[PDB]
Enzyme design. Structure first.
Site, PDB file in Angstrom:
ATOM      1  CG  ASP A 359      26.749  29.154  58.848  1.00  0.00           C
ATOM      2  OD1 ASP A 359      25.501  29.207  58.836  1.00  0.00           O
ATOM      3  OD2 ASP A 359      27.466  29.993  58.266  1.00  0.00           O
ATOM      4  CE  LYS A 360      21.866  28.202  53.358  1.00  0.00           C
ATOM      5  NZ  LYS A 360      22.718  28.614  52.211  1.00  0.00           N
ATOM      6  CE  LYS A 502       6.450  28.497  50.005  1.00  0.00           C
ATOM      7  NZ  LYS A 502       6.948  29.089  51.276  1.00  0.00           N
ATOM      8  CB  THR A 630      21.896  27.570  58.345  1.00  0.00           C
ATOM      9  OG1 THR A 630      22.142  28.708  57.510  1.00  0.00           O
ATOM     10  CG2 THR A 630      20.508  27.023  58.058  1.00  0.00           C
ATOM     11  CG  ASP A 742      28.630  30.369  62.260  1.00  0.00           C
ATOM     12  OD1 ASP A 742      27.543  29.765  62.367  1.00  0.00           O
ATOM     13  OD2 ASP A 742      29.009  30.914  61.204  1.00  0.00           O
TER      14      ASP A 742
HETATM   15 MG   LIG Z   1      28.053  31.719  57.668  1.00  0.00          MG
END
Ligand SMILES: [Mg+2]
Ligand SMILES: CCCCCCCCCCCCCCCCCC(=O)OC[C@H](COP(=O)(O)OC[C@H](N)C(=O)O)OC(=O)CCCCCCCCCCCCCCCCC
Ligand SMILES: CC(C)CCC[C@@H](C)[C@H]1CC[C@H]2[C@@H]3CC=C4C[C@@H](O)CC[C@]4(C)[C@H]3CC[C@]12C
Length: 993
Positions: A359-360, A502, A630, A742
């Site tokens: 995970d990020k 954006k 992620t 996670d």
């Molecule tokens: Mg996390």
């Protein structure tokens, strides 16, 4: 338990319910009180290795079957069962204790007599639980009331979906306007909530208040929901509980805990089956030798029981104690402090991981963003060059009372300090009240809050250079200067940032001058055409992005008091339209979005964790493929992938576009196939289509990638990715994470590692191994996994070798010496009893190391050897089998041929020769010598000499104290071991490892 149904939850009064709801408890335990023993027994005796013992023991009940003493078959198996049960039980108590910290958090609820303080476990559906700032939301809730005057709050969901953006949540309008917090208990209001489902970003509900004469009904959405596991970022909130326990949205995405078995255990189990099959084959041959002699079923299985020790219980005991020792070593390593081993039965799995999935948000990164670079085209200002920006600002605002580069720097800084959506929040420090600090703009009590952490980083950076923003309203914005004077700006227009445009824009008027200014900041791809002609935007922005920064392009346009009137008259004209409003206002804004002067480019970095780049490089050098799964957006995930060197600087990146069907997936998959050595970044939505329709092709293309980035992954999608990596490749996968999203992939993975998060512990609590930092993964994989794997393989193969040698020579004894006698069994219980003197030197291989701990880390390429299965294979097992057969045949045949008088003068020779051969073989396999192995080897010889001395006085065994005994023992001990000594030395010479 039951089918999911919508629930009518009354505000307060947690008793007007039709269905009983589960207790609000997070449980990572594997078994309850009732299912503990059956589950452990079945999980132990479901394999051939452990069921062999039961098959042996049970046979002792048939009187025509009984062989040997009864206490010899059940005491060792009883010890094994009792050690396994004790280990599992202790694991359960530790898990329950570790869950108690989360399950015993303290909160407050509202009652008719006043607020009362209760724990997190006792929270019932329909309860009004108060959640304070920086406090984890215990259960799923509906936002009712907040103490902030703006009627809103911010949520940090980094532990729920792994997104760094703060979520703006609005309360229930009816409950917000009540005069006091005690008023929600005197209103007949209820919430109609949808059935508990796995989706976390959606919610369909309805709030109804029957007390009012006109009934009030509100349609609830995700904007009113405080899911469990989120952290309240601002203010004190009050909510009504909708789901509890398993019904929490975090728990629906969490799979049931499972008992894990390593691949090494499976290989040993297969070896035991091979051994038993060989025994049965020789059994069928031996019975077919006599052409059937009646009651063959009795004699063949009796002879099975005679050779029943070809699969020893010492193997299981040695493996169990070795795993315990490995866990004790891992928990005591000072170079990876805080490591916790929960599944202490699989330390050897860390040495054969082929895929790492991480995970990020929170694992790779520190969840902190700071300003890095301010690029003005002709000169850039890094973290070491901010004292010149500060000096320019100070010089300008000193010359104000007492073009140039200072003017350009100030123009670039003020645009950043104004073009944002950050609102100051002032709290009472204890001495100064909240309303007291606001009128003086206290620096210690001011906190910046926004949905985008990048804007907060920009505002905090401008605070450091002098332009401190001290207040903001819906139509005003105040900046504090080094001269302590306050500039007042009026916000006339704001265009909030959208993920489609954006960009974000704003129009302000400086009350000191009256000039109208238009600010616009956003990504370089969209602002390339908005800004005027330049020669450095497309190059400097590209370089800053390649450095791993989040680049923004800031532009300006000074508006006169006449170019604004026609813009306002057209903007409001577009706004009061009843046909295609969006495209109407878009054109009005775009018409103003022309010929903007370029001011500066900003770089904001998401601070990684300590030693993340070296750890990723170490794991890449060992053949481990690292994929980042992620739940965050595409841009942040790509920026962190570039920042952590998950993709090399020269590496090409292909971004997987938004595909919706099979035909659209063919084209994009083929187009990516035409690329070479290019990393893949794919969204969750495209991943769903590719995995639904192109299951084989997508993974056959992704496994060849140097690295894979998959953003906006649901926890089920992460677990699915782990499952396909396990299935379609057949290689072990490791999952690293820190939040509740996670847990699914950590449990699915063969070895799940949980990094202790800053605001959550679910991944830490639901993982086999829990580490405090990401950098500890390198050591845990290269040292504590490699050593455990190698030591387990070596000790298992040596135990099998010892038992095979004993069985082979004891088969020679029963065949070529008498071939039939009762006194055979007295010798056929004692020459296999040597494993009391060589047991310590066999439990000394858990202290062995091939290379130093600082050498495995410095040379991760040693791991690529373990990835091939070198320590345990069929070649090594076959070589050990041949060695054992040769040793047994040599010992027994040489003992019989050299000298033959009677049974008790040959039993002594064979026993001592076997003990000495086994001790020498123990000394042969050692690579680096530890002093405990030396003391074990010496104590074994001392004990054997003591045994041969005590029996000499009692039993007339004077054979031992002669010269004919010594040379006869030492010739067999020289022809049994030393030929393998020569072979090992020549292996060292000719083919060094
Ligand atoms: Mg996390
Ligand atoms: C009462 C049990 C007797 C027993 O198992 O004997 C130990 C055996 C020797 O085989 P045997 O007795 O001749 O076998 C009879 C027949 N085959 C039968 O089992 O009917 O030898 C074995 O097959 C070994 C079984 C013992 C259990 C495992 C060894 C103890 C632990 C070893 C590892 C750790 C050692 C060091 C401890 C820590 C030190 C720091
Ligand atoms: C009698 C025999 C069979 C058993 C007892 C002797 C064994 C344990 C002894 C004999 C010779 C010894 C080695 C001799 C020299 C060294 C060098 C030094 O680095 C210490 C360890 C090491 C490598 C010793 C390890 C233990 C050793 C192998």
């Amino acid at each position: 338990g039951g089918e999911a149904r919508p629930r009518t939850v009354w505000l307060g009064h947690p008793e007007k319910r039709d269905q009983r709801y589960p207790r609000n408890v997070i449980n990572n335990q594997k078994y309850n009180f009732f299912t503990f023993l059956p589950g452990v027994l079945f999980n132990q005796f479901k394999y051939f290795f452990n069921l062999y013992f039961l098959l042996l023991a049970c046979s002792q009940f048939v009187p025509e079957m009984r062989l040997g003493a009864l206490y010899t078959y059940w005491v060792p198996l009883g010890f094994v069962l009792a050690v396994t049960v004790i280990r599992e039980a202790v694991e359960e108590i530790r898990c329950y204790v570790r869950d108690k910290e989360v399950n015993s958090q303290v909160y407050s609820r509202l009652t008719a007599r006043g607020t009362v303080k209760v724990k997190s476990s006792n929270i019932q559906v329909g309860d009004l639980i108060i959640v304070e700032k920086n406090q984890r939301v215990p259960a799923d809730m509906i936002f009712l009331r907040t103490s902030e005057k703006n009627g809103s709050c911010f949520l940090r969901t980094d532990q729920l979906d792994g997104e760094t953006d703060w979520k703006l949540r609005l309360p229930v309008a009816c409950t917000q306007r009540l005069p006091t917090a005690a008023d929600l208990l005197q209103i007949r209001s209820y919430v109609y909530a949808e059935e508990p489902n796995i989706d976390i970003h959606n919610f369909v509900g309805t709030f109804t208040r029957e007390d009012s004469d006109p009934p009030i009904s509100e349609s609830l959405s995700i904007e009113n929901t405080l899911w469990a596991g989120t952290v309240v970022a601002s203010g004190t909130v009050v909510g009504v509980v909708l789901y509890t326990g398993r019904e929490l949205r975090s728990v629906m995405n969490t799979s049931n805990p499972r008992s894990k078995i390593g691949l090494f255990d499976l290989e040993v189990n297969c070896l035991t089956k091979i051994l038993f099959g060989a025994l049965v084959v020789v059994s069928l041959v031996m019975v077919a030798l006599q052409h059937f002699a009646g009651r063959w079923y009795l004699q063949i299985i009796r002879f099975l029981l005679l050779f029943s020790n070809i699969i020893p219980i010492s193997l299981r005991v040695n493996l169990d104690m070795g795993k315990i020792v490995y866990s004790w070593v891992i928990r005591r390593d000072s170079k990876i402090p805080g490591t916790v081993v929960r599944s202490s039965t699989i330390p050897e799995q860390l040495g054969r991981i082929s895929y790492l999935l991480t995970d990020k948000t929170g694992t790779l990164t520190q969840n902190e963003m700071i300003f890095k670079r301010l690029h003005l085209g002709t000169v850039a200002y890094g973290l070491d060059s901010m004292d010149e920006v500060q000096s320019h600002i100070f010089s300008i605002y000193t010359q104000q009372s007492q073009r140039t580069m200072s003017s350009r720097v100030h123009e670039a800084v003020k645009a950043i300090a104004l073009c944002h959506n950050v609102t100051p929040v002032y709290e009472s420090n204890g001495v100064t009240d909240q309303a007291e600090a606001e009128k003086q703009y206290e620096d210690s009590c001011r906190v910046y809050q926004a949905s985008s952490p990048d804007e907060v980083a920009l505002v905090q950076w401008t605070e450091s250079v002098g332009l401190t923003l001290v207040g903001r309203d819906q139509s005003s914005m105040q900046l504090r200067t080094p001269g302590d004077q306050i500039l007042n700006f009026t916000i006339l227009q704001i265009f909030p940032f959208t993920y489609e445009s954006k960009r974000m824009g704003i129009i302000v008027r400086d009350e000191s001058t009256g000039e109208i200014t238009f600010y616009m900041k956003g990504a370089d791809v969209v602002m390339a055409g908005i800004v005027q002609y330049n020669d450095w935007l497309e190059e400097e922005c590209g370089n800053m992005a390649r450095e791993g920064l989040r680049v923004l392009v800031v532009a300006k346009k000074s508006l006169a008091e006449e170019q604004y009137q026609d813009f306002e008259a057209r903007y409001v004209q577009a706004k009061l339209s009843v046909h295609d409003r969006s495209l109407k206002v878009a054109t009005v804004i775009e018409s103003l979005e022309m010929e903007m002067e370029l001011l500066c480019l900003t770089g904001v970095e998401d601070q990684l964790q300590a030693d993340v780049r070296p750890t990723l490089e170490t794991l890449r050098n060992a053949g481990i493929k690292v994929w980042m799964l992620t739940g965050d957006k595409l841009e942040t995930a790509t920026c962190t992938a570039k920042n952590a060197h998950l993709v090399t600087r020269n590496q090409d990146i292909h971004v997987f576009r938004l595909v919706t069907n099979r035909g659209e997936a063919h084209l994009e998959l083929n187009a990516f196939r035409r690329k070479h050595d290019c990393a893949l970044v794919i969204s969750g939505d495209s991943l769903e289509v590719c995995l639904k329709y192109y299951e084989y092709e997508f993974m056959e293309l992704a496994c060849q990638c140097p690295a894979v980035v998959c953003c906006r992954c649901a926890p089920t999608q992460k677990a699915q990715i782990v499952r396909l990596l396990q299935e379609r490749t057949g290689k072990l996968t490791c999952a690293v994470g820190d939040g509740g999203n996670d847990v699914s992939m950590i449990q699915e993975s063969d070895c799940g590692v949980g990094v202790e998060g800053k605001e959550g512990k679910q991944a830490s609590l639901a993982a086999d191994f829990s580490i405090t930092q990401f950098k500890h993964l390198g050591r845990l994989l290269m040292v504590h996994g490699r050593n455990s794997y190698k030591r387990s393989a070596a000790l298992s193969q040596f135990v099998i070798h010892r038992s095979l040698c004993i069985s082979t020579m004891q088969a020679v004894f029963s065949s070529v010496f008498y071939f039939a006698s009762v006194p055979l069994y007295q010798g056929f219980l004692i020459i296999g009893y040597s494993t009391i003197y060589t047991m310590f030197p066999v439990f000394s291989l858990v202290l062995d190391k091939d290379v130093k701990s600082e050498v495995a880390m410095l040379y991760p390429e040693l791991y690529k050897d373990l990835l091939k299965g070198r320590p345990l294979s069929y070649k090594t097992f076959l070589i050990w089998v041949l060695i054992s057969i040769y040793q047994g045949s040599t010992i027994m045949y040489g003992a019989l041929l050299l000298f033959e008088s009677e049974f008790v003068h040959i039993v002594a020779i064979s026993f001592t020769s076997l003990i000495l051969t086994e001790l020498l073989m123990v000394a042969l396999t050692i690579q680096t010598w530890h002093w405990l192995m030396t003391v074990a080897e010496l104590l074994s010889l001392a004990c054997y000499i003591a045994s041969l001395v005590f029996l000499h006085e009692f039993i007339d065994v004077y054979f031992i104290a002669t010269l004919s005994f010594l040379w006869k023992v030492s010739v067999i001990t020289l022809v049994s071991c030393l030929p393998l000594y020569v072979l090992k030395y020549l292996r060292r010479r000719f083919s060094p490892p």
